[PDB]
């Protein structure tokens, strides 16, 4: 069918997030200024950044210089945990918008659940900036299922997505099931599992069958799942074009089950003490 070879957007409780995004996590400012313009030319329309990454300024510059109308880009940033108290929260959002050279972001996330600031205060501030017209959609990041349920319950506005580490080596069964019940999506980071993916023999085998790399296989395995969005880090023009070409093909049912078997109890890469929650077991 005509639309099955094209990138989809993912219904994310009303947010419609493009299934593949340009993630600026792990990217320097200079890397962003070089590569993001090319990404946008090539056809990327979802850009993901955060206060803590320190590259919002360059994201803003790159988008502005691209000549892509603002309304055509889906732009996400994240509130850093140091900015969680109400007044710091509101101020940090205005500051992000100055760096991003726009009056609104499409999506604003709480970056991590771990904080002394009450959840309802953070969720309250998310809703405030949404109502102010500074944020179109609100969401969360690295929340466990208990916190997802709590966020959905406390928030007047729907929670669009939970952005979490997700790759073949980390099982997200419980998180996905909760997301789908609550109507939110899951946004994946670390699809490549810090280099494990290109070295995986099973993924290279499946990739071979389709004329695709192990990397494209992992990206496809994510993007082929219902309600899953994937962020890619492309620090060179070559990975850029490769990562984008994942709507060409589909994995068989058996290929999907096999990639799912790669999950390991020690597969999680990102686990900062204090910020990370008690992950679902």
Automatic annotation (TrEMBL):
Its EC number is 1.1.1.274. The record marks 78 as: Lowers pKa of active site Tyr. Substrate binds at residue 111. Gene3D superfamilies: NADP-dependent oxidoreductase domain. Residues 20-263 form the NADP-dependent oxidoreductase domain. One of its GO terms (molecular function) is 2,5-didehydrogluconate reductase activity. GO terms for biological process: methylglyoxal catabolic process. The active site is at residue 53. Pfam families: Aldo_ket_red. The keyword Oxidoreductase applies. PANTHER family: 2,5-DIKETO-D-GLUCONIC ACID REDUCTASE, NADP-DEPENDENT OXIDOREDUCTASE DOMAIN-CONTAINING PROTEIN. This is 2,5-diketo-D-gluconic acid reductase B. The lineage of its organism: Bacteria, Pseudomonadati, Pseudomonadota, Alphaproteobacteria, Hyphomicrobiales.
């Amino acid at each position: 069918l005509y639309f099955q070879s094209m990138m989809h957007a993912v219904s994310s409780n009303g947010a419609n997030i493009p299934a593949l995004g340009f993630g600026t996590f792990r990217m320097s400012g200079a890397e962003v200024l070089r590569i993001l313009p090319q990404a946008l030319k090539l056809g990327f329309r979802h850009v993901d950044t955060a206060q803590i990454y320190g590259n919002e300024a360059e994201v803003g510059e790159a988008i502005q210089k691209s000549g892509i109308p603002r309304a055509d880009v889906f732009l996400t940033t994240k509130v850093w945990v140091d900015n969680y108290r109400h007044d710091a929260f509101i101020a940090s959002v205005d500051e992000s918008l100055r760096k991003l050279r726009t009056d609104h972001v499409d999506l604003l996330l709480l970056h991590w659940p771990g904080s002394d600031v009450p959840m309802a205060e953070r969720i309250g501030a998310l809703n405030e900036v949404r109502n102010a017209g500074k944020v179109r959609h609100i969401g969360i990041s690295n929340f466990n299922t208990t916190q997802m349920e709590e966020a959905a319950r406390l928030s007047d506005a729907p929670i669009a997505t939970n952005q979490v580490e997700y790759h073949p080596y980390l099982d997200q069964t419980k998180v996905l099931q909760t997301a789908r019940r609550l109507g939110m999506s899951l946004t994946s980071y670390y699809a490549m599992a810090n280099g494990k993916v290109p070295a995986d023999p099973l993924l290279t085998e499946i990739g071979g069958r389709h004329g695709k790399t192990a990397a494209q296989v992992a990206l496809r395995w994510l993007v082929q799942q219902q309600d899953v969005i994937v962020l890619s880090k492309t620090a060179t023009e070559a990975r850029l074009k490769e990562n984008f070409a994942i709507f060409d093909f589909a994995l068989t049912r058996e290929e999907m089950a096999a990639v799912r078997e790669l999950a390991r109890p020690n597969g999680r890469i990102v686990n900062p003490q204090g910020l990370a929650p008690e992950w679902d077991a």
